[PDB]
């Protein structure tokens, strides 16, 4: 995923716009339940790893079980799957984070269900709404540069 | 003079070696970095009053799939090309049993030409393309994403998941420049594989009509 | 005056009014505009 | 010499990370160099394309009826929607992607570049009561 | 069953659904909740969604023809 991001974009900048945040959710998660980082904590590895598949599983765009429908399912969820990976890993979780057991299921149990809540409505007007999204900048645009 | 005239054959030939690698011929691996001074020694140094005539540069292929189905390329040598001249090579074709071909014309053709080959639809299917149009490879451009053509059970294969039509899709007329590098007719359907910095990843399709 | 009837539909799709398929999935990801915000990747930019 | 079109070339090279070459080094850092550009004032891409020394890849003119010919038609969305861009995020605006998506889609949708226009609209797949609505109710509705 | 839409009330079908609800009791139709003291025909259908007990079954148009149909209490109140 480091060799694909560095592909996607070419430049090098980081600035993405994503679903929900997930430093500000660890941030919770770590108030929540009165997290010392001071202390060893008892997450066990391979359990960070395994909830993270298994979230990373119940995420769908693209609803489907035959080939075609489950690889633009692939393509839809790539990028933010592959940003979930990169700051749910075990190492830094275990190094900076240090979340205890019962604070990971609630972690995990919230990323899914604030994601589910952002995918759009069924009958919107999306076209008027990009129409006067675009109209109105137009008004700050300068006359002669 | 020659110098820009021995430069210029390498580069369109080097053009139309991935040209039929992108339909699925077979190309030898050499041939595609085939560099200058190597086809400068093979070929003949100049072509002005030399060995290379703009004949001797042909190219004949094979497809990878079947050794039956092939295809020619023709390097024309007067500037505009009139009728029985591209019938001198339909008779190429009517002796050697090849149907696919491609005519890399020069500088243009005559519109009497461009009544003559449209008429044999069904048989003896030609390209004319010209000699500045293959100068560069469009296809390894920043703005174009890559496109793949799709078989006719694929292509069957979407409008029975999203319970499509196939008039319903995007379309893209058989004219523009990568519709033809890829020599597609009306009723195919060309996939696009694009990067978007909101997924990551996007394919869509195009009707070729 | 030129847009006015695109909309979404029943199946995730970005439809014309003539249902002509605009978009397979809208704006690509399937995500309202409404709910997203900036963050980092912290995976590009470090060495090896 | 040169291409009869194009008048003046100017040259410089940029202090910006905008249109400079950013390279990966062997320790996978990014790396910006600085390096010379040109640019023109009369577009002829197609020849300027197929001349020595000059990167095929990387070069580009700000006319989209010129790509549309030379390059292709998904070229034209890439530069509409990169023209789009620049243009809204000139004084450091910023606005969302999903609607310049949308409408660089919609703008090319049927193959050919229709403009958004009298004439433009005027031609699609459309009912007679929507081009009633616009200043020719009559005719149309008299040929329906 | 082959329900492919989502099991999510959208945001305009609850808009609907409190609009009609509210109007038929209006017009004298039988409650379905134990209110208290309440008189508002719209603050007596907003506590009825709140207890899943609208009889209202809603209809989704595929663009291709089908339709399915949902029950109120089936799907998940966004709200």
Not at chain 5, 14 to 23: E, F, Q, S, Y
Request: charged share 25%; net charge negative.
């Amino acid at each position: 995923d480091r060799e694909v991001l560095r592909v996607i974009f070419p430049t090098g900048d980081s600035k993405v716009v994503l679903p929900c945040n997930l430093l500000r959710m660890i941030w919770n998660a770590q108030k929540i339940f009165h997290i010392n980082p001071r202390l060893p904590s008892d997450l066990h590895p391979i359990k960070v790893v395994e909830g993270v598949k298994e979230l990373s599983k119940k995420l769908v765009i693209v609803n489907g079980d035959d080939p075609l429908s489950r690889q633009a399912q692939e393509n839809a969820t790539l990028l933010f799957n592959i940003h979930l990976r990169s700051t749910l890993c075990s190492r830094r979780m275990a190094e900076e984070f240090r979340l205890s057991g019962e604070a990971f299921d609630w972690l995990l149990g919230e990323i899914e269900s604030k994601f589910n809540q952002a995918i759009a409505h069924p009958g919107e007007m999306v076209g008027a709404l990009a129409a006067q999204s675009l109209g109105e900048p137009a008004t700050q645009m300068t006359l002669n540069t | 003079d020659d110098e820009e005239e021995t430069y210029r054959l390498w580069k369109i030939r080097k053009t139309i070696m991935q040209l039929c690698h992108d339909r699925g011929y077979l190309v030898t691996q050499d041939e595609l970095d085939q560099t200058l001074e190597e086809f400068k020694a093979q070929f003949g140094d100049k072509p002005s009053e030399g060995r290379p005539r703009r004949t001797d540069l042909t190219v004949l292929v094979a497809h990878n799939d079947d050794p039956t189905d092939q295809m020619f390329v023709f390097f024309p040598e007067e500037p505009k090309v009139g009728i029985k001249t591209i019938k001198v090579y339909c008779q190429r074709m009517q002796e050697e049993n090849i149907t696919r071909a491609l005519i890399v014309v020069q500088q243009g053709m005559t519109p009497s030409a461009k009544q003559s080959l449209v008429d044999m639809a069904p048989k003896y299917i030609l390209e004319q393309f010209l000699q500045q149009e293959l100068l560069i490879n469009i296809t390894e451009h920043e703005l174009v994403p890559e496109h793949v053509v799709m078989t006719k059970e694929e292509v069957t294969e979407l409008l029975a998941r999203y319970k499509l039509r196939e008039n319903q899709l995007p379309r893209i007329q058989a004219g523009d420049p990568v519709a033809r590098y890829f020599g597609i007719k009306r009723g195919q359907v060309v996939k696009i594989i694009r990067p978007s910095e909101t997924a990551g990843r996007y394919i869509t399709y195009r009707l070729v009509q | 005056k030129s847009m006015e009837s695109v909309m979404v539909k029943y199946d995730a799709t970005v439809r014309n009014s003539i249902n002509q398929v605009v978009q397979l999935r809208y704006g690509e990801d399937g995500l309202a505009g409404e709910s997203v915000e900036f963050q980092n990747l912290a995976t590009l930019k470090p060495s090896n | 010499q040169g291409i009869e079109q194009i008048s003046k070339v100017y040259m410089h090279l940029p202090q910006t990370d905008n249109k400079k070459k950013i390279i990966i080094t062997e320790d996978g850092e990014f790396k910006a160099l600085q390096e010379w550009i040109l640019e023109t004032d009369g577009v002829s891409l197609m020849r300027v394309l197929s001349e020595k020394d000059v990167d095929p890849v990387r070069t580009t003119s700000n006319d989209i009826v010129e790509i549309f010919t030379v390059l292709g038609i998904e070229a034209v969305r890439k530069a509409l929607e990169r023209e789009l861009y620049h243009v809204i995020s000139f004084d450091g605006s910023y606005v969302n992607y999903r609607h310049l998506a949308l409408l660089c889609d919609t703008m090319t949708c049927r193959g050919h570049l229709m403009a958004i226009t009298r004439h433009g609209v005027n031609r699609q797949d459309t009912g007679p009561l929507m081009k009633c609505s616009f200043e020719e109710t009559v005719d149309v509705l008299m040929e329906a | 069953q082959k329900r492919i839409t989502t099991p999510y009330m959208t945001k305009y079908e609850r808009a609907r659904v409190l609009g009609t609800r509210a109007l038929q009791i209006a017009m004298c139709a039988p409650v379905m909740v134990e209110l208290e003291g309440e008189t508002d025909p719209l603050l007596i259908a907003m506590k009825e969604l709140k207890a899943r007990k609208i009889p209202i079954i809603i209809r989704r148009y595929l663009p291709d023809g089908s339709y399915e149909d949902w029950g109120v209490d089936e799907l998940i109140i966004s709200d």
